[PDB]
Each structure stands twice: as C-alpha cells, then as structure tokens.
Amino acid sequence: VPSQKTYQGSYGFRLGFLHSGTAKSVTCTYSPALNKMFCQLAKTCPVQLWVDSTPPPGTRVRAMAIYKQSQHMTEVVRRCPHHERCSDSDGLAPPQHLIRVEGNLRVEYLDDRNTFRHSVVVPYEPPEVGSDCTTIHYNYMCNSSCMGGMNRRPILTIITLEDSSGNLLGRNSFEVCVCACPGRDRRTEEEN
Ligand SMILES: [Zn+2]
C-alpha cells in the first residue's frame, strides 16, 4: 500500500481547490470540512498546487488513487469493466486507469511493474498569470457507484511532488467521490 502520509517538504507543498460552492451546475466541488472532492465523471477537476518555494526544473507531479478503507487498501483502484471497455480513449491514457490529466500533452501514465498500481504524472510548471498556484485538470473516468469497479467504496487521491530523478519532495491527499450531482452529495455528507 502506497503512503498517504502528508509531507510538505522543502518546498512547503500543500494542496488547494477552487471555492466552487455546491450549485446544481457544479462540475467539481471541494469540501474543506471533509477534505473531500465531489466531481462528475470525465469532467474537469482543478487541483491546485501550492508551494512556499519553486521546485527545481524537471519536477513532476504524480496522482494515484487508493481505497480509503483498510480492508480494501491493497486492492488496486481501477475502472469497471463497462468503462474500461467504453470508447472514450484519448490515445494516451490506458483504458483501465481511473485518473487522467486533461489538456497536457506531456502527460505520462504508469502501470507499476511490481505493485500493479496506476498513476498519472505531469511536469510541474510554475504558477500561471493571475494565480498564486499551479493548476492541474484531472478527470475521473468512473463513478464511485460503478459496478465491477469502486462499487461505492471511497477512495483517496494521493498527490506526490517528485524531482526528475524520482526523489520524493512532497505529498498530500484528499478523498474523492465521483458522482452525478457533486453539489448535492457534498451538502449531504457535510450535513451529517
Ligand atoms: Zn465505471
């Protein structure tokens, strides 16, 4: 099981999210109280990277999903049969991978040779104009409810900052629910 231990590191690495609210039309919304993102399948999911100092050239940013519950933590998070056989390929992402990155031609996908885990990595770039952070647009390609997949089992997304040689620079994580109505689901899970 990959580490989900938070680690800000030398560069003061922390995660952020748009303050999107919970309207019916929201694609992606983050709950600070739950540390949990609610998002629609295949829709854009802004995840912000915040640093106290800019990492060196050649830095990469990796994302991986693992199951939250200890009794599923060794099971590899992957797309359901129905979705992995869907005709939604972009030509880059393997069909079995839950998490894609949209709008980045330098995206890299990895099936771990030993753990069999899936992950997706992009070059870290410095903050764009108008932002104090760097935004990556993720897409989750399976619903949490999906049969033969997650089957309503909650997952975390682990975001690691690593240098060009593989060394760990930083790590954070947030819970995800991929669902039809993110705004409503967020309100409900906070209502408890
Ligand atoms: Zn699915």
Curated annotation (Swiss-Prot):
Result after altering residue 84 to K: In LFS; germline mutation and in sporadic cancers; somatic mutation
Tissues and organs where the protein is expressed, per its UniProt entry: Ubiquitous. Isoforms are expressed in a wide range of normal tissues but in a tissue-dependent manner. Isoform 2 is expressed in most normal tissues but is not detected in brain, lung, prostate, muscle, fetal brain, spinal cord and fetal liver. Isoform 3 is expressed in most normal tissues but is not detected in lung, spleen, testis, fetal brain, spinal cord and fetal liver. Isoform 7 is expressed in most normal tissues but is not detected in prostate, uterus, skeletal muscle and breast. Isoform 8 is detected only in colon, bone marrow, testis, fetal brain and intestine.
Modified residues (N6-acetyllysine): 24
Effect ascribed to mutating residue 52 to V: In sporadic cancers; somatic mutation
Effect of residue 184 to T: In sporadic cancers; somatic mutation
Outcome recorded upon mutating residue 82 to Q: In sporadic cancers; somatic mutation
Phenotypic consequence of residue 79 to C: In sporadic cancers; somatic mutation
Variant or mutagenesis effect after changing residue 100 to L: In sporadic cancers; somatic mutation
Phenotype for residue 160 to K: In sporadic cancers; somatic mutation
Reported impact of residue 174 to S: In sporadic cancers; somatic mutation
Effect annotated for changing residue 55 to S: In LFS; germline mutation and in sporadic cancers; somatic mutation
Result of altering residue 40 to H: In sporadic cancers; somatic mutation
Known outcome of mutating residue 129 to F: In sporadic cancers; somatic mutation
Consequence recorded when altering residue 102 to G: In sporadic cancers; somatic mutation
Effect of residue 88 to V: In sporadic cancers; somatic mutation
Variant or mutagenesis effect after changing residue 40 to E: In sporadic cancers; somatic mutation
Outcome recorded upon mutating residue 61 to A: In sporadic cancers; somatic mutation
Protein name (record): Cellular tumor antigen p53
Species of origin: Homo sapiens
From-to range in the entire protein, with total length: 97 to 288 of 393
